[model samples]
Target chain A: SMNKLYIGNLSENAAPSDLESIFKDAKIPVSGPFLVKTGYAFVDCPDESWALKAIEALSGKIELHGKPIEVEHSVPKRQRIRKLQIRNIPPHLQWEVLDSLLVQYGVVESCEQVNTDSETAVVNVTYSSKDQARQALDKLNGFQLENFTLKVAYIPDE
Target chain B: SMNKLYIGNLSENAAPSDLESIFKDAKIPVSGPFLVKTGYAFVDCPDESWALKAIEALSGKIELHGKPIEVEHSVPKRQRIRKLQIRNIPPHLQWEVLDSLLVQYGVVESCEQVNTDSETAVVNVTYSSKDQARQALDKLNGFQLENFTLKVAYIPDEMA
Candidate 1:
């Protein structure tokens, strides 16, 4: 398995050197603490097991400028071909509820909600694996959220 | 030490007879499969160990009218204390993340997010013991969630 991780929700002023310092303090050997953006970054460990330890150590507990960061296995572009288009969510539904509902089916790589009317919202959810997306598509196609029903479809490409 | 459970989310049509049959088939003798409301009920096992078995066998898997039921220990009114109130969570924060955040601090008995505007939400959290709630409160107050900071307070009357 790839040893890289996609870490997100970083502080605007966070630097690669800060992450390097953290890993050094934790005594975990890592390579390429690459900063992708102001709020996101990537880092690689020696192996998958070390990747897990890195996540456990920093994912939910590590605070940078007062926010806990999100960390997950980084999927190469070639393996990220699967995506699901989720539509017709109840407008008042909280983000956390939707996140948990989707996570129950699979590991969501990313989720972006689109602009829609006040009554509904459309979100594009991506899964790390095609099988995971398919599982969510099968189970959630007709799942009800409050008074609204969900409509799930596969996004073929782009 | 009580073996009683408070079960909820039963189908409106579920009856004491239906639960009795399911328990009988599982070879777990239950006492007083009492119906409480349209979608709620309660039952007692011979002991805590048996209650664990009953919960393992039935919670989240058993279905009536195509709806799974929820099961938890039935704390008597006197023992139902140790409530923690968490507030100022970012609206976009997922429920599982909040659950994990608090659960990491201690054993959470139940958590309910209070209905509020979309900007932020408040949650009422309950712990099994006062020490657990205190530990969480000490560590979690001012904990950041996205751009917002968490505010954790003990519901004084509910605290043991």
Candidate 2:
């Protein structure tokens, strides 16, 4: 899918011609520039390549009425179910501690610390979405737990 | 700990006042806004109420100079030592198959599949962080292996 580019800081009074003129300086043509229903206008670029350039050239550098502009990637998150599990969980963990840690990413459905005669424990988790699962992996990848070193694995859905 | 916010779609030429003014319209008054670096800014709000409102009103909705804004929570994963023994693995899946599935998510330190009449496998995964472990469990739950439903059990660090 093509990436959309958004331009900000126009004089609420500025029109689409003003946006086209601004990008024209960079040798980029605007696809459609219109007054943003949300108080800003969106200007579609020829492609993501031009969008990146516009971001680089105008972001934080271009001033409209002395206010700088911001540019960013606009791709929607990939959607799917992503499950993460941590084995070798120590039995000492209460549900409160486990749930508290996962609450950072999204709603956590379960934190089953499996009980066993052996010293090791099991930790199972469920996130709201694939993006939340990814976020969980990235977020917990750096912490130092007391006695257990966490392992992350995902169940691939067919 | 308090929730962290990453503000996006800000103009490069914008100043603290611009941010304050913009946030004010969104009904999130900032206690103060500080620069994270060039082209990025972080603000401290009164509570999660304002913070939540700020993030919801701005993330991917408003455009700033042809760019949409983004806001998200930022937190680092914790460190922990654990192990998971995957049960009900197919005989063909034994070792290599299961290892490959876990390798991409984290570090697969060791794997030994058991073949005694019980179709089971033991996989030792050293996750990059605690968050990955949680992610893995979420991924493995309700999974199907061969004709049997799969179960993942965590082993303690001492055992590892």
Candidate 3:
């Protein structure tokens, strides 16, 4: 639902109560002002129209702690199970190193060693999302790992 | 690298060959015109300066199939792991139902079903990103599942 909105780029000193007061003064019906960090928050309006009204009324119009806040509808993320079949990782590169590289793009839900011989190892890595898998592919596809070049491609969900 | 640029919102009739010709005419040194779906594509230049020139030359200036294209830097996504601790799920609700609910907001990296006896069932869900977990919490927290109302909170990396 578009009832939720993201309020971003808040001042470091800005608090949830401070945000609630601003919304309160504007006569907007709101539930949260759930402060994620010092500079970001999420507020739940009654509906999409109310969210739009809040965006129109509060975005760039309200300043908290001398900085204007950004307001926009909070879009839910698309759920994707990103699984990749990877081949040819050199034996010298330990699982720790491999996992570190994998996690840099996104959380590696699981990495199973499919096969390993005298030369290299074939592994399947399941990332948290497709974006993560794509990012990993961008940085590491055809990348040289020790004596071998890593090959990565999407494998269908199990 | 700074060489990446995202081109979006092309007309359905637009083709990669058509886009390549535009870049060729512009003399922009580029790599693959990686087409994603019908209306979007990405291209990699040699350097930041070349990417800038492409953006300057083509953004809103080049029309493919009668619609102006949008071009911007293809920034990589920021990595963040979001974990949530949810409690008070009615035991009558099956794991499949809970799993379905959790997956609606984000990909569940892991879901540990904790303590289901005479009391309510508690679960620790790890999401792919903070945005996902938070959105789930916003929508589902305090929502009635069967008989019990779900209570959601942010948990640390490990259970203490």
Q: Tell me what fraction of the real C-alpha contacts between chains A and B each candidate also makes.
A: 0.00, 0.00, 0.00
Q: Write the per-residue lDDT of candidate 3 for residues A13-55, one digit (tens) a residue.
A: 7665677777878788864334345577776787655765676
Residue pairs with backbone overlap in model 3: none
Say which prediction, candidate 2 or candidate 3, comes out ahead on DockQ.
3
Which is the better candidate, 1 or 3, if ranked by DockQ? 1
Considering only chain B, what TM-score does candidate 2 achieve?
A: 0.45
What TM-score would every model get versus the actual structure? 0.37, 0.27, 0.29
User: What are the runs in model 1 whose C-alpha is more than 4 Å off?
Assistant: A1-79, A83-158, B33-36, B76-78, B82-159
Using DockQ as the measure, name the better of candidate 1 and candidate 2. Answer: 1
lDDT tens digits by residue: candidate 1, B12-126: 8888888887778868777655666778888888875566556556767787778887665666656545776666678777786577566644678788766543357777788
Best by TM-score: 1
What shift in Å separates residue B139 of candidate 1 from its native position after superposition?
13
Give Cα distance to truth, residue A98, candidate 3, Å: 51
Candidate 3 residue runs with Cα over 4 Å from true position: A77-158, B1-149, B152-160
**Candidate 1, A1-158: lDDT as tens digits:** 44667788898887666776777777777643243456887766777567656655676668777888766566545554668766668877899999989998788998887654336677778887788887998888789989788877555434
